[PDB]
Amino acid sequence: SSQGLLGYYFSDLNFQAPMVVTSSTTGDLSIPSSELENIPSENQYFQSAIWSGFIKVKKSDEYTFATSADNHVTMWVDDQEVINKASNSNKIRLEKGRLYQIKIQYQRENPTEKGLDFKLYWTDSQNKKEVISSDNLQLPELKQKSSNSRKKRSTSAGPTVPDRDNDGIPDSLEVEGYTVDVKNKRTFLSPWISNIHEKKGLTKYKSSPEKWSTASDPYSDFEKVTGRIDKNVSPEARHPLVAAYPIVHVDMENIILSKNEDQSTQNTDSQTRTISKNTSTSRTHTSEPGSNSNSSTVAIDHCLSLAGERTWAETMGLNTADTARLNANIRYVNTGTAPIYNVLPTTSLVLGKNQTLATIKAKENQLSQILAPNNYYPSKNLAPIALNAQDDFSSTPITMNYNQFLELEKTKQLRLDTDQVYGNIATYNFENGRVRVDTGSNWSEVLPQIQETTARIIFNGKDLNLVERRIAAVNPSDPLETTKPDMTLKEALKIAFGFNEPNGNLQYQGKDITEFDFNFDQQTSQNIKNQLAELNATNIYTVLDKIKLNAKMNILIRDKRFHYDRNNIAVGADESVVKEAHREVINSSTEGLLLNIDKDIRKILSGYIVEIEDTEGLKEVINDRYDMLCISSLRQDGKTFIDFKKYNDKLPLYISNPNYKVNVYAVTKENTIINPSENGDTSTNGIKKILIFSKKGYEIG
Ligand SMILES: [Ca+2]
Ligand SMILES: [Ca+2]
Known part of the structure; x- marks a missing residue:
């Protein structure tokens, strides 16, 4: 359904002005005028087209190829011409289970009809002619590398539409702007035209013609906008300028402290002397220069829970030579824009500044479920994970000495530092139009590039929790990164966090932008200061559409109503x-x-x-x-x-x-x-x- 040949339909005679890019599941490559709602009537006349992909046959045989317009067509199979401007009775041998590249070009001058009626047929040795069925056609290999079966480029023979990064979007569209509309089981990619598209509230996309994924993530610009992508990727990250990547922290829901058994005492028959407390956990962000880290902070309930006004030591019967023990319920939280499938990052449970009490590790490749964006692991409808699970005989005790235990009582704070080890990525396969976990593809190969080429914005407008997003942004000093669209601060807020501007006023869910403050790290601050000086602007809120973002900027935006600690928690x-x-x-x-x-x-x-x-x-x-x-x-x-x-x-x-x-x-x-x-x-x-x-x-x- 997302499979078939890829078609480029041009208004001009020479393959220069692409009006529609779209796929066809079968050899019916037609676009009826009824589907051309988003293109000017005058551009609905197609004078040329190019289709590309692969054919795979179900039975070896000799086939003859034909189209609806053989006098206007040239067709190549695996670099061999099978049709050249005339109907051909020629038969070519095709072997079952083998993949052959297909390229078809069509040229017409002054068509009298809008759209295009065009069919690709074949006839077998038994003289049975038919439009090529869907099971026989596959998309081009629109990837950065070839597969064992499917070469990523097409035969040099004939017309080559400028697609420098091989994502399937023509250079010219990526640069000048494009839009995507679904009509009839199909996605149409077309040039952006102000006076038709803006008033439909259609999105105007731009992306780099030289980066397969403009955000340096694992999904191509084409995959994103045509929906050839893991359904669990966040909606905002279907935008080619918004990075799709996981962001994981650990949420601790509650804790139980006990006295650790000792070699010395035989008596294990005693009364329960545990201390159980609810805990509140928040993902944090610090002014630490160049942190790209996951951390959360845990607050232990200080409200009255137990009788008397004893110290924890007294409650538990803990003396200076005794050791204490900690258990807890936790969940993983994905606040990012891509899912995790076969790993869970490792986490350090830390007391004070740097006393590690435990290392929390899940079993590699033994996840019970996906960890999806805006979701938890285990899902909230399931029990949480216990640090020492009931009959887990391999779980290391989380132990504290008397002074640490006293320190925990004083601070009633723990920290959870989680690494960025996220495992393999589920990617789209152009051979079968499926999305599957690719064992040869790892998030560790992608994160650094995302971090290096994007501007980061952290925003707490949603429930006062810190949410991080990354937007593709020019790096003036990196040639490749200068091939990307300009990204304004205003536009970034719109696409990454869903700000809108119903009445020429930027808002987040009813709240005006001026209800939030801006906070910049040192470099970002100097950069924006300079930009403002060049604009002769004294107030950032009035020139958000004129402030440009660059790769590696860090911006923090918070609800002004609140005071914040050093972790930017309200x-x-x-x-x-x-x-x-x-x-x-x-x-x-x-x-x-x-x-x-x-x-x-x-x-x-x-x-x-x-x-x-x-x-x-x-x-x-x-x-x-x-x-x-x-x-x-x-x-x-x-x-x-x-x-x-x-x-x-x-x-x-x-x-x-x-x-x-x-x-x-x-x-x-x-x-x-x-x-x-x-x-x-x-x-x-x-x-x-x-x-x-x-x-x-x-x-x-
Ligand atoms: Ca491209
Ligand atoms: Ca691109």
């Missing part, structure tokens, strides 16, 4: 923003508050502090402990309930005097205390908080 926001987000209150009572809170805002709140203030202005903190601030919960109707009773002995607030104020403060992640202070103080004293509700008792009820 950890706070302005008092103003936080107050506004709680301002609209549904219900209030002695039991709690009922609120409607922005989904992103909630991400940066770690808790709430509830306090009653008497008339002399003295305050009584109801939940007065650093670990008692998680009193909010999200209801299944999406509202947030801040619950006063939770840490008030399950009792509604008692308000002695209706002139007393009930104040509720919000605490952001960056201001959260996760351990007692060194004086041992567990109180909320000194905690930086934001007043978000203050009502006298009688305004409350």
Whole structure:
């Protein structure tokens, strides 16, 4: 269905102005005028055409070839002319299971009809003539190398359409602009024409005529735009200027810490003294010069979980000579644009700056499923992976000494560093129109080139999580890379992250571009500064369509509402923003508050502090402990309930005097205390908080 001969249909007589490039599954190479909706009526007159591919016969025999227009045709089989401007009774011997190159040229001057009616026939030794069936025809080998059976070029005999990189798109289209439309089981590739195509919201493609994959990834410019590609490749990466590659990090969902058994004690009969905590993990990005790395950071729940106020050591019965042990549930997350099939990258679990506690490895070539873009492994509908799986007798214990365990308690942070070892690639095969994992093709052979020739943009507009995309961009000092289209910052945002501009205003899902900030590494910053100076522009937001990207730039774009740590994780926001987000209150009572809170805002709140203030202005903190601030919960109707009773002995607030104020403060992640202070103080004293509700008792009820 994606198989057959590849056809180039030209408006001119000499193979110079290609109007349509498309394939035909059978020897019916026609394009009826009804399919020429996206081309000007006057260009719908085709004066020449070239078809190429292979024929493979099901039975050896002598065949005679013929077309609908033998007087206008020259046809070559494996460099031999079989038709030369006249009908031929000549018979050529073809052997079963063998592949023969086919090239056909057609020239007509002043056709009176639009489109082209053209059929390729053959007749066997028994005088049975028919249009060549689909099972006999194959596409040209539009790859960077030949196969054992199929040569990547066509015989030098006759017309050669300029296709320097052999992807199947003519040089001239790649440079001047093209578009793709599907009509009737077929994809038509045609020249971009402003006054027909723009108003259809069709995409204008450009790509390098000298790079088979303009983004230096493993899928050709032609494969991408015609859908001859792994269906799991992200939609944005079907654009020849957007890189298709995996990006993998590890998400830890929860953790369990125990005391490690010892040679010395025979007693294994004891009471459970484990510590189980939920964990929150985010993919990170650091200002580290030239990082091309996968890392994530793990936050261990500091909310009150166990009785008393003991230290972890006390809870577990851990003394200074004992060792502790860690287990966890994790999943792999592909935030990139291409799938992984037969490997999973290796990961270091790290305490502090550089204390590696474990190496996490999956079994090579034994994946239970694909790891697809915007997805997880295992998929969310399945159980996650345990670091020490139940009856895995080969799983190395994750062990900590007493000081490390104490360090974990203090920081309540782990880091997961994941390498870029992603295994083999599923590529399109022009012989059978199938996509299959190619064991001779490895992501390790592709990543460096992608990283080297693209501009990287990292954007958190989607749920405040960091998403990286890479866009093909000129490298002024690399001749080949100068053959690629100019890429503007505006265009990059459109194609890589789906920004649009419905009213001449660049937006991401309703949010104006000005709601996001720009952050550049040193080189990128100097480059853009220089560009702005040349434009005599003082404000980047007003010249996004004039800023050009170059290979190796790094750009980070974040939602301005938030404060960010060094990992570019959102950890706070302005008092103003936080107050506004709680301002609209549904219900209030002695039991709690009922609120409607922005989904992103909630991400940066770690808790709430509830306090009653008497008339002399003295305050009584109801939940007065650093670990008692998680009193909010999200209801299944999406509202947030801040619950006063939770840490008030399950009792509604008692308000002695209706002139007393009930104040509720919000605490952001960056201001959260996760351990007692060194004086041992567990109180909320000194905690930086934001007043978000203050009502006298009688305004409350
Ligand atoms: Ca090409
Ligand atoms: Ca190309």
